[PDB]
């Protein structure tokens, strides 16, 4: 275990266990999904409740008018990163009076989260992120991991049993780009459902949706607000 406790220690295999371990934090978090048409970026996520008397965890957060995110992993780290993301955006508007290009914001998360992975005593951020935004280059869905690495996606999903969702998304990609909103959201809700135990599915209590697009500023939907999307579902493969 001499190579497991410090991110400054490379293993004889050219790996950094601390980083890998942090990645594990993402997998634990409940699954979330992201996908975009050619005019909308959509975030979908499954919320968990500690006990039955507690509310479901937030999974989608508003960054700026053209950006929102879904989280998986340490909540405290999500808030740190979210606030960094929010700050960076406020600065852009202040100085340039224009929204921060989503890809540029992603590069900043990349640089910011890389630093601690290389310094003694520091730890990787323990959170993954799906980023949905819309700039003058259209809709975007990015992914960021505890390792300062990030990805530009057509669609994606992280979290527990997100492997199913990924699989479902990989099958209907070609469809996405031309989908109209409600259809795009359905594909999302549908993919999320893939990550669940057959004996249960999407409730207006455990689903959260985030939408941003040429026609709409990032908006979140959580309870009754989720119904309109849940209606017109699909059998749900038995």
């Amino acid at each position: 275990n001499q190579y497991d406790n410090d991110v400054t220690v490379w293993s004889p295999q050219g790996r950094i266990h601390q980083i890998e371990y942090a990645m594990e934090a993402v997998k634990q978090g409940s699954a979330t999904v992201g996908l975009k048409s050619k005019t909308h970026a959509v975030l979908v996520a499954l919320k968990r409740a500690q006990s039955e008397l507690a509310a479901h965890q937030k999974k989608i957060l508003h960054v700026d008018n053209h950006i929102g995110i879904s989280i998986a992993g340490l909540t405290a780290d999500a808030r740190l990163l979210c606030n960094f993301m929010r700050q960076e955006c406020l600065d852009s508007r202040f100085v340039f009076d224009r929204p921060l290009p989503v890809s540029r914001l992603v590069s900043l998360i990349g640089s910011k989260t890389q630093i601690p992975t290389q310094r003694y005593g520091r730890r990787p951020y323990g959170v993954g992120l799906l980023i949905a935004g819309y700039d003058d280059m259209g809709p975007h869905i990015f992914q960021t991991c505890p390792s300062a690495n990030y990805f530009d996606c057509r669609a994606m999903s992280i979290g527990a049993r997100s492997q199913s969702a990924r699989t479902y998304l990989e099958r209907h990609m070609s469809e996405f780009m031309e989908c109209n909103l409600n259809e795009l959201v359905k594909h999302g809700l549908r993919a999320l459902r893939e990550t669940l135990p057959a004996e249960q599915d999407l409730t207006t209590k455990n689903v959260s949706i985030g939408i941003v697009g040429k026609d709409l500023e990032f908006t979140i939907y959580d309870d009754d607000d989720v119904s309109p999307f849940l209606e017109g579902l699909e059998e749900r493969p038995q």
């Binding site: 990645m23 934090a25 507690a54 509310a55 405290a76």
Partner: protein, 234 residues
């Protein structure tokens, strides 16, 4: 085995934060319930001696007229978080001239979440998490509200919640008794009924703290008498 305080386990969880969640299980038990007519908080002081002033033991405190908070775990640690909260509510009032919601307050406290570390840190920096669990009960523009927060920095709202050693049991009972339509009167009774169960000692009016906050009345810490009145119906 000696590692940094910010090390992850192969499971993707910070050892320290996990080890303090553990510390909470050694604290006294406290219960909070949320009713449309108000919120109440109850905790067993867990007196360890006759020679100890039962009053010099406050596990329930006022954050602000519209917000009360109950704690459990390493109480010495909670001192700090409690103050940051009171100070926060006042900075908000100073700046915006309006009261702070119960959610924002809880959140403010939660940001000191994983604010611990060694290298690359200031001198007056925490070296470990706080071994505390908290329950913020109060009333604001959104009606009465109860929030729970543990050392991971995570916090959420609850209709009813229990923290401390008897937490598991207590919460089971709370699930059996809660009604989305019950009352602050019913609520307080349940709290004591359940608290009475889980306590290892016989429920005295001098070994428990009870307080409420309702849409009208500002935070109130039940008196030794007002306890007699409710305990009367064991």
């Amino acid at each position: 085995y000696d590692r940094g305080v910010n090390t992850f386990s192969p499971e993707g969880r910070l050892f320290q934060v996990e080890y303090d969640i553990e510390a909470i299980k050694l604290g006294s038990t406290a219960i909070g319930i949320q009713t449309s007519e108000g919120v109440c908080l109850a905790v067993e002081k867990r007196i360890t001696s006759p020679l100890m002033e039962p009053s010099s033991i406050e596990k329930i405190v006022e954050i602000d007229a519209h917000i009360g908070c109950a704690m459990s775990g390493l109480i010495a640690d909670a001192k700090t978080l409690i103050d940051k909260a009171r100070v926060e509510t006042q900075n908000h009032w100073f700046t915006y001239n309006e009261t702070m919601t119960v959610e924002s307050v809880t959140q403010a406290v939660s940001n000191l979440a994983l604010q611990f570390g060694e290298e690359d840190a200031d001198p007056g920096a925490m070296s470990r998490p706080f071994g505390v669990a908290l329950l913020f009960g109060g009333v604001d523009e959104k009606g009465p509200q109860l929030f729970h927060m543990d050392p991971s920095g995570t916090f959420v709202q609850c209709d009813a919640r229990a923290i401390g050693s008897a937490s598991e049991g207590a919460q089971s009972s709370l699930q059996e008794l809660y009604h989305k339509s019950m009352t602050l009167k019913e609520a307080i009774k349940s709290s004591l009924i359940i608290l009475k169960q889980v306590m290892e000692e016989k429920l005295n009016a001098t070994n428990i703290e009870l307080a409420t906050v309702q849409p009208g009345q500002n935070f109130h810490m039940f008196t030794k008498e007002e306890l007699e009145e409710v305990i009367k119906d064991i």
